[PDB]
Ligand binder design. Structure first.
Ligand SMILES: *[C@@H]1O[C@H](CO)[C@@H](O[C@@H]2O[C@H](CO)[C@@H](O)[C@H](O)[C@H]2NC(C)=O)[C@H](O)[C@H]1NC(C)=O
Ligand SMILES: *[C@@H]1O[C@H](CO)[C@@H](O)[C@H](O)[C@H]1NC(C)=O
Ligand SMILES: *[C@@H]1O[C@H](CO)[C@@H](O)[C@H](O)[C@H]1NC(C)=O
Ligand SMILES: *[C@@H]1O[C@H](CO)[C@@H](O)[C@H](O)[C@H]1NC(C)=O
Ligand SMILES: *[C@@H]1O[C@H](CO)[C@@H](O)[C@H](O)[C@H]1NC(C)=O
Lengths: 501, 509
């Protein structure tokens, strides 16, 4: 859970040397003692002393606190990678601000990965960070010459590893694609990203990022990862019992020589041999605890990244004052052709309009420029107060007024109910005479065919079939005169036959 | 400058005052039952004071009486795509041993996940089993663990405003005015008040004209291009899969960018299937632009033409086809409105100039009068039939009023008075008859006329001939005899030649 090669150092010198070793195993043994910070301080910051007082590496505080990539030990921090030979950490710059993260009181040095690279901040001897982090305040507490491990801070969670380079052609297509995800970010830490002709006050935002090594990194929002154990040729670092790491010559020979005691995982690959031996183990070891190496599968093409992290960052947001409006129309005018107004629009076409007449309303046909609107025919007399309201395309709302002249006492109907109550104008004044003449002519030749009926009655022809039914009714009535004769005769005869006694 | 449907308001409830250089001032509480009248006219609330010889009016004017809808609730629907992320591990570390160690997944069990950001949206973390071994990239011959997270995002940036409602009760728009100088327009609904503006609340009572077919239907309206439609939708809160309303959100500040909090969504919309080593997901959501019964701006559902009206509240209106009728009424409730009375009499005299217009019509007859006044009082022109009020100005001016007559000649006498100077005027003119308007193709009406005159449509004497004949009692008889004689001889003289055209078909050719 953090102890990789050995326990925590103690140190005795007030100002020692830290000689540079050549063995990679010796290097990985050295990292666990928290010496990269000391090398970064004694080389450039001029500070004399040592960091990580009997605390080791696992006790370094993290701003995320409870976070992944920390329960393991094989992951490489950016400082370890930098001391392993990758890109040099840039010096502190006055144009880079500090994200308002955790409390900085009591800390002595921290680092932050930016868009261009990685930066680090610290103070000289006898000074420490304040609660905010603008200046180094002198404190008597940091004067005993010993600095505990918790005073070194790291921001965000990161994993860095060797990567396979790619041609630039497959990289640029990423940068454009990542720029289509956020049409809001314009400038990040003074680095152009888009063209918005306007900035705003930068605000912190926490995102993930992927490092390729060709340009100013890549911002990550959605992506699928894949952990691969690999462990092909060189993934194991180890030591001896108590003494520490073995010699460089032993490490070089162990991969090619014969009998080399070790874990069965290393045994199955190295080419180990077995035989009678004693307690003379030749740097026996195993495989270092780490999940492996990460790959990224962004929409098709895949790439192994140099670094992979999640942290806070400084950026701006686009701002635009779109509130301008337009007004209403541009010199529209209202006409009146026949029984209805006619709207005219010059700026653009008409989407929908609602004409309000004296005692009616109507909706425009919509679609054209010089639209025509017709009301109900029959009642548009007198002087009106036409009032229109509507909206055009491209977001404009327009209202207008106006009027026109319409017939006052003109109706102009041919033959309906509108005339019989009005014989005074009735459109053509010399028109009632036609009605009078026609009606009197029809009245005279609608009574002439009544005297013919009166003198020659047409029902006498039907007076020949009714007497037929009367004859049948009479025959039915006189039918009954026979039964009252025959039955009575039979009854009288039967009575007379039996009346003799 | 006109009025109609007087109610004379209510007196004896006013409480008089005094001070500040005349201007008696008053406060009143009461009620009224002004009629609805047709859209275009106005009904007023002529006030009175027991002592002062001045009055102030309160007129209600209606423009549109359309069939707008109610509003149970409102919400904002954003369009959403589907996004997914996946992470593969190997069974070598001390973090995972076999799938999910507990009964159910808790928190996220890992960092870097796209759920700690701001634009991520709602998510559902899950774990599953995938391939493991030498062929896949693990050092253990056991199935590996796959951790997947699914969410939704909103590229573009459209936003839909939805209001589920099935009432469709008649409504109207009115232009209320205070007595002094104020004018404000608002829209009452048939059953609910319209809030207190300055002490006057006016509510409408309709007839509840049922529509033919209208199930649960919601008016949806885009907020970028302003495109309106009617589509089925569910009530606020619960989201049933199938209709619009699955990405329910309430605030147009977190609707464009979907946030974890602020609104509620359902599951089974971003369903994820696991591959051999990764995870890819496809959305089952349906955009609101095509769901079911998605209509457009012009529609003819039932017997009502649902056009689009340009207002501030309820921007979807129905409309009848030919004329139709709705019999409703307003009910003004005034609580603490204040009115100022001059308490000074002034000269007021005038006479009419001309009358013209309709018979018993839908608009009445306009009468134009000319007045010479030295005050700001309100006239009270009254007659045998209707009565009207308006506002007179300083100096000499002319005004027009609407009076509804019944016969084809006007000779009545009025009793015009403004302030304190009751006098007499006269009337004179001729009027014509114009019937109810017909229907003509190409016109889409958008109003519910609230009154139609019928039952007095018959031909009449003593005017059927005044433009046909002379003018006089004996002239009528002389003209009748003349018109009877004018044609009898002509008709009965053609009898001689009638046979010449009648017997050709019945005799030799
Ligand atoms: C910190 O100081 C040490 C001490 O010189 C530097 O170590 C040197 O590294 C170079 C190349 O890596 C070697 O050629 C030298 O032999 C090293 N010096 C010694 C004394 O062994 C180290 O490079 C410095 N780190 C910096 C400047 O970032
Ligand atoms: C470090 O300590 C050793 C003795 O342990 C001493 O010889 C050496 O000079 C010290 N290094 C210094 C003082 O730089
Ligand atoms: C949509 O139209 C179909 C057509 O028949 C109808 O049956 C259905 O009820 C309509 N949908 C809704 C939600 O009313
Ligand atoms: C009626 O009088 C008014 C004066 O206000 C005048 O404008 C109008 O033309 C007159 N109309 C007729 C028909 O005399
Ligand atoms: C009377 O009315 C006119 C016009 O409406 C106005 O200018 C004037 O101020 C009014 N009189 C008073 C005393 O306010």
């Amino acid at each position: 859970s953090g102890p990789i090669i050995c326990a925590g150092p103690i140190h005795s010198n007030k100002s020692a040397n830290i000689p540079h070793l050549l063995g990679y195993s010796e290097k990985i043994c050295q990292i666990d003692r928290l010496i990269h910070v000391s090398s970064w301080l004694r080389n450039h910051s001029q500070f004399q002393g040592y960091v990580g007082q009997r605390g080791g590496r696992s006790q370094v505080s993290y701003y995320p606190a409870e976070n992944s990539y920390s329960r393991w030990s094989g992951l490489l921090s950016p400082c370890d990678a930098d001391w392993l030979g990758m890109l040099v950490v840039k010096k502190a710059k006055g144009s880079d601000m500090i994200v308002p993260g955790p409390s900085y009181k009591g800390k002595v040095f921290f680092e932050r990965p930016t868009f261009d690279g990685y930066v680090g901040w610290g103070c000289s001897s006898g000074k420490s960070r304040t609660e905010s982090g603008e200046l180094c305040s002198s404190d008597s507490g940091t004067s005993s010459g010993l600095l505990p491990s918790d005073r070194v801070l790291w921001i965000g969670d990161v994993a860095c590893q060797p990567m396979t380079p790619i041609p630039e052609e497959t990289f640029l297509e990423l940068k454009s694609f990542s720029q289509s995800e956020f049409p809001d970010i314009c400038k990040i830490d003074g680095v152009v990203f888009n063209q918005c002709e306007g900035e705003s006050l930068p605000q912190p935002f926490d995102v993930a990022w992927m490092d390729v090594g060709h340009s100013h990194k890549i911002i990550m929002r959605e992506h699928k990862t894949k952990w691969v154990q690999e462990s092909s040729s060189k993934d194991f670092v180890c030591y001896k019992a108590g003494t520490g790491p073995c010699s460089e010559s032993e490490e070089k020979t162990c991969k090619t020589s014969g009998s080399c005691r070790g874990d069965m995982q290393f045994c199955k690959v190295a080419g180990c041999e077995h035989g009678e031996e004693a307690s003379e183990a030749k740097c026996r070891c195993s495989l270092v605890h780490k999940p492996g190496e990460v790959v990224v599968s962004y929409g098709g093409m895949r790439v192994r990244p140099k670094c992979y992290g999640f942290s806070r960052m400084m950026a701006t947001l686009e701002v635009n004052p779109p509130e301008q409006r337009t007004g209403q129309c541009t010199g529209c005018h209202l006409e009146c052709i026949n029984g209805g107004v006619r709207l005219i629009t010059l700026t653009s076409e008409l989407k929908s309009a609602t004409v309000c007449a004296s005692h009616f309303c109507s909706s425009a046909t919509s679609g054209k420029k010089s639209t025509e609107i017709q009301f109900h025919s029959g009642s548009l007399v007198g002087r009106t107060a036409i009032h229109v309201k509507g909206a055009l395309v491209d977001g404009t709302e327009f209202t207008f007024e106006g009027s026109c002249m319409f017939p006052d006492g003109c109706d102009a109907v041919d033959c309906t109910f509108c005339r019989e109550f009005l014989k005074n104008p009735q459109c053509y004044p010399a028109k009632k005479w036609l009605f009078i003449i026609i009606v009197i002519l029809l009245g005279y030749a609608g009574l002439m065919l009544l005297t013919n009926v009166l003198k020659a009655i047409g029902i006498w022809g039907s007076w020949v079939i009714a007497p037929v039914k009367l004859i049948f009714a009479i025959i039915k009535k006189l039918m009954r005169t026979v039964s009252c004769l025959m039955g009575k005769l039979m009854d009288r005869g039967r009575q007379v036959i039996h009346e003799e006694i | 400058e006109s009025c109609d449907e007087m109610v004379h308001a209510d007196s004896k409830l006013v409480s008089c005052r005094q001070g500040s250089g005349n201007m008696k001032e008053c406060v009143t509480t009461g009620r009224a039952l002004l009629p609805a009248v047709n859209p275009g006219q106005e009904a007023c609330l002529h006030f009175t004071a027991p002592g002062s010889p001045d009055s102030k009016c309160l007129k209600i004017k209606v423009k549109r009486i359309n069939l707008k809808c109610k509003k149970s609730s409102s919400y904002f629907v954003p369009d959403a795509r589907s996004r997914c992320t996946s992470v593969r591990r190997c069974r070598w570390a001390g973090d995972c041993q076999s799938g999910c160690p507990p009964h159910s997944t808790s928190n996220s069990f890992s960092d870097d996940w796209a759920g700690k950001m701001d634009r991520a949206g709602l998510g559902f973390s899950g774990c599953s089993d995938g391939c493991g071994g030498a062929a896949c990239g693990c050092f253990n011959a056991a199935p590996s663990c796959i951790f997947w997270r699914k969410w939704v995002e909103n590229p573009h940036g459209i936003i839909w405003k939805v209001s589920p409602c099935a009432a469709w009760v008649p409504s109207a728009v009115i232009e209320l005015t205070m007595p002094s100088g104020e004018v404000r327009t608002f829209h009452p609904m048939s059953g609910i008040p319209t809030q207190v503006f300055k002490g006057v609340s006016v509510t409408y009572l309709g007839s509840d004209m049922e529509v033919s077919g209208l199930t649960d239907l919601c008016e949806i309206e885009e907020l970028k291009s302003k495109k309106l439609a009617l589509a089925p939708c569910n009530q606020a809160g619960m989201g049933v899969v199938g209709k619009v309303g699955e990405i329910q959100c309430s605030s147009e500040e977190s609707a464009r960018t979907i946030k974890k909090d602020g609104c509620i969504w359902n599951a089974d919309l971003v369903g994820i299937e696991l591959r051999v080593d990764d995870a890819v997901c496809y959305s089952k959501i349906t955009s609101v632009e095509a769901v079911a019964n998605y209509s457009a701006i012009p529609t003819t559902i039932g017997g009502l033409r649902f056009e689009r009206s340009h207002d501030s509240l309820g921007k979807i209106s129905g409309s009848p086809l030919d004329i139709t009728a709705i019999r409703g009424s307003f009910s003004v409730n005034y609580r603490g409105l204040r009115l100022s009375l001059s308490e000074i009499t002034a000269t007021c005299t005038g006479e009419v100039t001309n009358v013209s217009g309709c018979y018993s019509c839908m608009t009445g007859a306009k009468v134009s009068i000319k007045l010479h006044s030295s005050k700001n009082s309100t006239a009270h022109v009254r007659c045998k039939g209707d009565e009207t009020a308006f506002s007179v100005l300083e100096g000499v001016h002319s005004y027009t009023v609407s009076l509804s007559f019944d016969h084809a000649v006007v000779d009545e006498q009025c009793q015009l008075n403004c302030g304190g100077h009751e006098s007499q005027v006269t009337l004179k003119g001729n009027l014509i008859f114009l019937d109810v308007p017909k229907f003509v193709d190409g016109s889409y009406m958008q109003t519910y006329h609230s009154s139609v005159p019928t039952g007095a449509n018959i031909p009449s004497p003593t005017d059927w001939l005044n433009a046909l004949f002379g003018n006089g009692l004996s002239r009528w008889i002389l003209g009748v005899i003349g018109v009877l004689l004018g044609g009898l001889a002509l008709f009965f003289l053609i009898m001689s030649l009638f046979k010449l055209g009648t017997k050709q078909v019945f005799r030799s050719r």
